Amino acid sequence: DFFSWRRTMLLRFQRMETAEEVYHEIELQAQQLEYDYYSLCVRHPVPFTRPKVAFYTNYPEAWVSYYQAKNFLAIDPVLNPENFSQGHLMWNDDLFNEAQPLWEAARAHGLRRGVTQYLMLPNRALGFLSFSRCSAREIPILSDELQLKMQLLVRESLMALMRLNDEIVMTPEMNFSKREKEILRWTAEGKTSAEIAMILSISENTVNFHQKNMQKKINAPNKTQVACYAAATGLIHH
């Protein structure tokens, strides 16, 4: 009877044409599980020093504004894979021992209990789904059925959002030609422009143009950043 839930959810997400349908479905499923608020967050693998983070939530506008103002993304333990197990995490008082200011601000805004699930996407982006409620001592649930239900919800929603090329999950656009990616693969092996020229039987002049043309559309200083970003997102071995 649970397996039929999995199958319907699988049928639902595969037939979605809109992002609003994805976020709405998450809203419903969260509510079926006695949770009021959902939040879907994605941390991209690049840039390496300040990884891009996009999110979408039905949290109260006041809490979102407060959260961003205090820069809580940078210290939220819910977004730290270390604190997870089997990609699952139940919110508790101890988890926020390092970030109490977050916890108190969240409680002051009406977030008593919550839970988070996470996975890694094909572009190596880290997706986080969080559910939260304002009510204590209600709890629905088996955890096992909870872990497994949420496990599916992160996957199929974010994968759906990728089919639709949504801005929240799609990495900074890097539409390269098959020629450009060949040069990237060899650059990533530590080949010089001269060696890549001989290997591909083209002039070093043509190699450097391609090299510069990729740096153009990404706005990057050298061939080193372009290659590492490509390696980091899996554009090379997808």
Ligand X SMILES: CCCCCC(=O)CC(=O)N[C@H]1CCOC1=O
Token couple for 229: 């970003």
Which CB sits closer to a second copy, 111 or 227?
Answer: 227
Contact call for residues 44 and 51 (beta carbons, < 8 A): yes
Contact call for residues 94 and 127 (beta carbons, < 8 A): no
Min. distance of Cβ 222 from a second copy in angstroms?
Answer: 4
39 binds ligand X (CB under 6 A): yes
Among 113, 149, 155, 210, binds a second copy (CB under 8 A): 155
Which CB sits closer to a second copy, 126 or 134?
Answer: 126
157 binds ligand X (CB under 6 A): no
In the window 217-236, what residues touch ligand X (CB under 6 A)? none
- What is the four-CA torsion angle of 219, 225, 226, 227, rounded to 10 degrees? 180
Min. distance of Cβ 217 from ligand X in angstroms?
Answer: 30
15 binds a second copy (CB under 8 A): no
176 binds ligand X (CB under 6 A): no
Q: In Å, what is the CA distance from 36 to each residue of 26, 90, 92, 202?
A: 11, 16, 18, 60
Q: Which does 122 bind (CB under 5 to 8 A by kind): ligand X, a second copy, none?
A: a second copy
Sign of the C-alpha dihedral, residues 209, 212, 218, 222?
Answer: positive
Min. distance of Cβ 159 from ligand X in angstroms?
Answer: 18
Q: In Å, what is the CA distance from 99 to each residue of 3, 17, 114, 236?
A: 38, 39, 16, 38
Question: What is the number of other CB atoms lying within 10 angstroms of the CB of residue 155?
Answer: 18
Name beta bridge partners: 57: 39
Q: Of 67-75, 101-109, 110-118, 142-150, which part binds a second copy (CB under 8 A)?
A: 142-150
In the window 64-93, what residues touch a second copy (CB under 8 A)? 81, 86
Name beta bridge partners: 85: 88
76 binds ligand X (CB under 6 A): yes
Point out which residues bind a second copy (CB under 8 A): 1-3, 6-7, 10, 45, 47-49, 51, 81, 86, 120, 122, 124, 126, 142, 144-145, 148, 155-156, 185-190, 220-225, 227-229, 231-232, 234, 236-238
